[PDB]
Amino acid sequence: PRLTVFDAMHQLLESRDWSAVTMSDVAKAAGLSRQTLYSTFGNRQGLAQAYALQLSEKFAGEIRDSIIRHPGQIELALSEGINGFLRSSSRDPLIRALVTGPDLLRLITTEAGPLIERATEVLMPALSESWMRIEASQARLAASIIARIGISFISLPPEDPDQLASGLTEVIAPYLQKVVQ
Amino acid sequence: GGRWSPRLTVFDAMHQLLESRDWSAVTMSDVAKAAGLSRQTLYSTFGNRQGLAQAYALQLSEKFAGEIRDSIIRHPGQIELALSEGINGFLRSSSRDPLIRALVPDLLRLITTEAGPLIERATEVLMPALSESWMRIEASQARLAASIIARIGISFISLPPEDPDQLASGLTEVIAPYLQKVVQ
Structure with missing residues (x-):
């Protein structure tokens, strides 16, 4: 189905x-x-919402895979994960659609927390049950913050494509290094 | 004034x-x-009406970024207390604002998703709050963090936080580690 x-x-x-x-x-x-x-x-609305939930899931997975791929290397795990999301987010035709025009689409990218919720559901375990062994509360926290920032760069894309990746790594890594176990 | x-x-x-x-x-x-x-x-x-709500949003942007900057200036040497107070003050303003209340509206989604003039203004207020305040952060890193703070802040207006305060003190705990690395 x-x-x-x-x-x-x-x-x-x-x-x-x-x-x-x-x-x-x-x-x-x-x-x-x-x-x-x-x-x-x-409806077409319920269709695009399933597509967004799938994008939500795929993007959070891009970050999760890089975390697993690089044990012990937080800054390298993030740098790779964030570039992968930004790359996929560009190539996506519905995300490429929205930033050209689609009122139904903005409804889901601002008034849908199922997107943040799914993305948080993928992220949290990648943080707490991965090698990072971060406590579940702080994993929730970071996961939601990472999710919301991610949406922010699909809504309004970054002018710098990857110097955003390299910047956002630098902001979030100091937190993760502090909460790592 | x-x-x-x-x-x-x-x-x-x-x-x-x-x-x-x-x-x-x-x-x-x-x-x-x-x-x-x-x-x-x-x-x-x-x-037109778009230019009206867009300049209003530019004023909100500056006003919200000022809350954070004022808390930074008010508490020198206390990175976590400045962020904690700034974000809390921002969240309070963002609640009491009538046009933000109003947003929960196609044109409003336009400015809060396809306006970086909003991020840019907030960034112009936030950068000196980091770069030319006591934190003495280099303009390179200040600009960076300022944009992320702007974008996160906008995000909490588009989708409001379930947690009223457990968002604010949460986001503090995420961003204070970055600031502590760069405060010279």
Whole structure:
């Protein structure tokens, strides 16, 4: 039901605007019935919200993977993770859409905490049950702050593409080094 | 220090107006009446309703960044107390503001998502608060931290915090470690 449809919306969105995408076309490209789509996602609003939750999840994972990949190297783990998110966030057609224009999309990027909540759910374990062994409260704290900053750079992208990455590493690493165990 | 300027009298007018009306039941006509300016001078300096709410937001941006800077200046040598007080004071203002209340509105999402003139102003107030205050942070790093503080702060207006204070003291604990590394 879910995981192949996001794939369909991406490839569809590379050639069309967000207005040249309707439930019909998405079901055809996904290989699903118009019945299964409307039944599980509802509207174009509920569709784009599932896409955002998937983006939320993927981006937080980019950071989590870099954390696992680099034990003992906090600044290098972050630097790699933050560059990966900024890279994916650029290549995404719905995120590339929003910053060209989509009122429904701004609704989810400002009045959706399910996005922050999912991203926090991926981040927290990468902080507390990873090698960092950070206490669960401080992992929550840092995870929410990392999530909100991440959204801030998809809403308004950074003019400096990566000198943002290299800067934001430098701000958050001193915290993590202090709370690491 | 005086609020006779074209812009400053409009913002006062708008604020007082917004206490009792929504941003949608308020038009240029009304703002020109309350400011004591002509409909001609309004469009002449501001453009339209967008230019009105956008300059109001620039004033909010500066006002919020001032809260943080004032707490920095007020507590020299206390990095954690300055941040703790600054953020708390900012959150209080952001609550009591009528246009921010109003935002919970397509044009408002435009300024709070596609306005870096907001981040830029907040950054112009915040940078010296870090770079030319007692913290003596280099302009390179101050600009950096100032932008992140601006962007986080904006974020807590778009999506408000579930925790009223456990957000503020939380964000302090995240940012104080960075400042402590750079305070010379």
